[PDB]
Point group: D2
Chain length 346, copies 4
């Protein structure tokens, strides 16, 4: 039936939607959430994960770990909040923050308070899960992959028993935050480079190639409303506000009429991979490039050019598109979860 997994993320509006999908999906049995640094600090992403869980009535059920604050060998790009903005904008979190229950991780760790949380806390829990897995243990990663790189440096022999499903990278289209690279890779390219060389079974399930086709149209919004408004009009509003928080930026900067939704597509891959195309290849992560670090460079074209002249072994699976009906299936899954959450919030 259900698949045990861990979520590693940097919420983040997209990651919030991914957490909702993974936690409320009966197909996924979330063991824990670990947070990482991003354009916000790891302490902020920690809080944002807990906010997400408390909004959906699960903050007392799922342990959240606060991971590493910066990349392996590069500087963080995290910005301070300027003057007491929430850091997960579009919503007032004041109530969610004050009603926040105790993090279950504290009891697992034998800690009294959150000030004792350390980046490597999740390690022993992941090792237990990896050890107990019959084949491989599933991690969904939708932020920087520093946490997993750090884990593999401490537990190198676990690489062969880990399967990663990620939102990361761009292959046949260009990048977002930099010309040819995607945020999650370029923020710590050494980490993903390390992971690909470690023996991890790695799938780029949700590169920009796919997520730029997963768009929040007026049609989607109406489907959200039909599923959520009868149970929780308040939740309806928050979801829409979160989904549309960057609508203007995506339009004005990137030419999107309707904004994309990224990270939940990775969880959807673990739920229902049959909706995705897959190809195997060797991915090199650019680390030396001055302007191109985090580029995901593949030998896919060389395979089509001259199959026999391939030298480098395949080290990854890449999903370049959803199959017909895949977009509909994704939105159906997401709307189902939002509806269930709406029923629980009331």
């Amino acid at each position: 039936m259900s698949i045990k997994c861990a979520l590693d993320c940097d919420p983040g509006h997209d990651d919030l939607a991914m957490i909702m999908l993974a936690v409320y999906s009966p197909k996924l049995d979330v063991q824990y959430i670990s947070t990482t640094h991003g354009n916000q600090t790891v302490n902020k992403t920690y809080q944002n994960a807990r906010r997400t869980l408390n909004l959906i009535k699960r903050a007392d059920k799922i342990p959240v770990y606060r991971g590493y604050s910066k990349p392996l060998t590069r500087e963080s790009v995290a910005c301070p909040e300027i003057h007491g903005e929430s850091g997960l904008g579009g919503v007032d979190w004041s109530e969610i923050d004050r009603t926040m229950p105790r993090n279950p991780a504290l009891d697992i760790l034998g800690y009294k308070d959150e000030s004792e949380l350390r980046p490597d806390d999740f390690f022993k829990h992941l090792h237990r899960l990896v050890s107990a897995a019959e084949d491989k243990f599933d991690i969904i990663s939708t932020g920087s992959e520093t946490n997993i790189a750090q884990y593999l440096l401490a537990y190198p022999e676990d690489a062969k028993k880990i399967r990663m499903t990620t939102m990361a990278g761009n292959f046949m289209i260009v990048g977002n935050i930099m010309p040819f690279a995607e945020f999650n890779v370029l923020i710590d390219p050494e980490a993903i480079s390390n992971i690909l060389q470690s023996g991890v079974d790695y799938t780029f399930a949700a590169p920009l190639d796919i997520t730029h086709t997963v768009l929040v149209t007026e049609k989607v919004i109406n489907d959200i409303k039909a599923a959520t408004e009868p149970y929780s009009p308040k939740f309806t509003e928050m979801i829409i506000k979160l989904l549309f928080f960057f609508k203007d930026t995506y339009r004005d900067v990137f030419g999107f009429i309707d904004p994309p939704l990224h990270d939940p597509v990775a969880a959807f891959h673990l739920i229902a991979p049959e909706w995705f195309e897959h190809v195997r290849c060797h991915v090199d992560i650019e680390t030396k490039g001055e302007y191109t670090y985090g580029c995901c460079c593949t030998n896919l074209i060389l395979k089509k050019k001259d199959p026999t002249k391939i030298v480098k072994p395949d080290n990854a699976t890449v999903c370049l598109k959803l199959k017909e009906g895949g977009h509909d299936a994704f939105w159906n899954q997401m709307i189902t979860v939002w509806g269930e959450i709406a029923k629980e919030i009331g």
Copy 2:
């Protein structure tokens, strides 16, 4: 009326079409052609330029220089012909080769034979043209830019009086020969880096962004036939064979139903720039990247994000698309030239 210019290229089927357009266009007054290394040796590209000129009855009129054999600081990617293939495939050049007239460059240089041709031969001629130009002298470049980099190393003070119009690079779409870079840049990225820092007025007139939309459809072929068949059915056949020589590769490797035509678009920019969109930006050429050398990385997105936070000065113009009617205008120009050539061949 007409604009004096020089062509620097690596023919190449695309470059052949560019030479035809520039030479037969009354708007462009071609002073010389210099050839460069590419996926064929500079001696082969030299021959291919002369073949082009002799096919169109101009080999006695235009001096051709044989330029540099390899990049500034990298290895050539030139391949040998395997067993006496022409090197400009789709056509038997045996007659064109044997009827080849003397290269006018030899008399300019005071040389007796082609074995005396040296890479720096074109320098003095270009310097005369640059010196005599009222404003700037126009160069059309559709291969590696090694020759122009070499020129500027010898004549640094001429940079400010040169305007380059190129087929090179990719900006908002991915690369061809490598994941994120285009052949002409990645073959000698140091050369283009040098040029952009030199003071040259540089326009990326025909990046893949445009040329991947300039497609040889059945409609185009029929228009070619209507213009050429009444005067020279033999020429009609050769043009089509040259245009379609890589049709299968473009289809099977790159998914093109109809194949692109690249290099002549750069000459069309010099003829009629009003059909092109233009934007100014700072282009960094990746030289350190292991897998991403030759990437054209711009601050275009940073301009749209935060105009006031721009630091690096603009160093290039980029043409990201043709305006409405631009494709039609391009094909009309090309077909007009092919028709005139057809009349001359008979």
Copy 3:
């Protein structure tokens, strides 16, 4: 008495450094962490425990087994199927058989050494850093991967750590590569990270110094005079360890008498008055293809034009021992070897 931790990859030199630090009454060793080197971190772990048991301290000092490879580069460790111990020239069979339980296991609540994990030392170091009045002292004489890993997990502790290292070369060339020293080039990103972190960092024992700390026949005779009357067996093994690479140093590097490296770093913590010190900005080469691990400083620019300095100082460098420093070092080492001889 100064509380400290040792991080090392024994290693013949590191063995001598452990002996000095542990037997010196000036240093109170809280733990030893081991790192990857020419051999695996599991071998260096064993070699540290061998050292402690030889000197009758293996029941007193916890040993942690640290990280197996660099942050972002491959290990240079031989594969175990080469069968190289990393403490050659001596039969360890008795030392291995008589080995007592590692005190680390009880601290960690582990039953056996198979449970040791790279990050085990973290909580112990954090306790020591927290309790330090000023800064806590670490002696590092191998790759610095362990400390980089620690600082990635505890970035706010950087400002309360002082590192004293054997690493680098400044005014002379390198050993394993033309212009760089083994401990840096094995993980240059780690040292780069440490220098940027806020750690108070001293290059106490670069090759500049250690290549002048030579095991002469005079030194050997002084060792014998101190050790032979109490333990002739120990005398033999110390000399065999000191001279294990004598031929290579001679034939490859032109040394008539071989150097002794790592203990010089511990000697700096014991008696810094014997060392020259200069502050500067050290850049660690990480991009270079053939020069990664090079320690590049602005020392010449300081002497050229003091006011035109741009980069802030991030390190202290010891370029030479002062007059009498060599004598003082050997006196210290011989004293410790003598005390071990009396015990062991």
Copy 4:
């Protein structure tokens, strides 16, 4: 008598090298090409002509003005508005006024020096390379941009060129940067290109040698004995040129007596028997951020394990002068200065 060309950036050292090569009967200098350095290539052009006119040879030897900057990097030349000549310590006013026409102009069919272009020397070098029975000899004592540019234009000539250079440092550290020497680091891509091209390349005068070629009080007295009886004015200027950087070498680099570099390369072409030679593979660092221009060899790997060598030899390196080599060098230099004194 060996036909050769000089490529240089005078420069006080290069001035001495020109004097040696031109006045030595063993070397038949065909031309001098100048390159960019600490000053512009136009200044080094002038400085070469100054040198020739001082020694009464400016009407005999053509001088070419080469490339103004490195292949792919920025020049490190001061801007001309600093007003630094690059041959400081001497008034050149008379030498400038009496300067005869450059013979290069007639070879090139130019009317004046304003027509000189960087690639002017190419056709002359190609004639000499073509006519050489074996290989044609180039002495290079500045950036090697000119020769790299030549080989890009004439790749098939590489196999008929022999280069003898002052460049690099191998078993000691660098000068202008921690681990690299000026002539390499100013254009490392150029030397990288040359080593890959098929040129027969000798590092005849790395810092390893030139830092042992010192202008002692003994040398100065020998200079005086040879020159003062014929031209006391020349004596003064030679000494002033030799000692122009004496204070900097002392205060920055610890030299009691300053080195003399570039003429050692010409001395190698005259009398190679005074030099040790070893063949190896030299990699020039181009990627390094702080270490570009480092000359990294496989010399240690050869001594470690001769059979495990992978990369083919691409260079000869001279790491030291043989016994009597220093004496022979100074004897040669003093002889030339004496002959100049008699003429000038």
